[PDB]
């Protein structure tokens, strides 16, 4: 288990060094954007929360395809001010709802040391 605490501070600089594989072993959910909502990486650990197949989002658009749910402007519309920002720090709960079992999850999104993309990690409370 990859050992890396929901919410730190430092949280974008342990996980730059991580490949697919090694964000398998984080104790949350991590799905990692591009600046248009594009899932680019995609965990276990978030499979495990939504039933999603992580294999089978990538290159999906977060947004518009997989998760409507989020299309508001509570959730959607922080990412979109953060991304033409170019900084973005948040951390709220949400229920997802979409074709699931409703559940209560806390979300932090935070950019990413790369180029122009962003992290939303998941757990549940």
Same mark, same amino acid.
């Given at each position: /288990?990859? *050992?890396?605490?929901?919410? %730190?501070?430092?949280?974008?600089?342990?996980?730059?060094? /991580?490949?697919?594989?090694? =964000?398998?072993? =984080? @104790?949350?959910?991590? $799905?990692?954007?591009?600046?248009?909502?594009? $899932? =680019?990486?995609?965990?276990?650990?978030?499979? +495990?929360?939504?039933?999603?197949?992580?294999?089978?989002?990538?290159?999906?658009?977060?947004?518009?395809?997989? @998760?409507?749910?989020?299309?508001?402007?509570?959730?959607?519309?922080?990412?979109?001010?953060?991304?033409? %920002?170019?900084? =973005?720090?948040?951390?709220?709960?949400?229920?997802?709802?979409?074709? /699931?079992?409703?559940?209560?999850?806390?979300? *932090? /999104?935070?950019?990413?040391? %790369?180029? +122009?993309?962003?992290?939303?990690?998941?757990?549940?409370?």
């Amino acid at each position: /288990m990859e *050992h890396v605490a929901f919410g %730190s501070e430092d949280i974008e600089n342990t996980l730059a060094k /991580m490949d697919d594989g090694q =964000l398998d072993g =984080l @104790a949350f959910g991590a $799905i990692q954007l591009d600046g248009d909502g594009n $899932i =680019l990486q995609y965990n276990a650990a978030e499979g +495990d929360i939504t039933g999603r197949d992580p294999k089978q989002v990538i290159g999906k658009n977060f947004f518009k395809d997989v @998760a409507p749910c989020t299309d508001s402007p509570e959730f959607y519309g922080k990412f979109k001010e953060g991304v033409a %920002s170019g900084n =973005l720090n948040t951390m709220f709960e949400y229920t997802f709802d979409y074709q /699931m079992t409703p559940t209560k999850v806390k979300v *932090h /999104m935070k950019k990413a040391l %790369s180029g +122009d993309s962003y992290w939303v990690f998941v757990k549940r409370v």
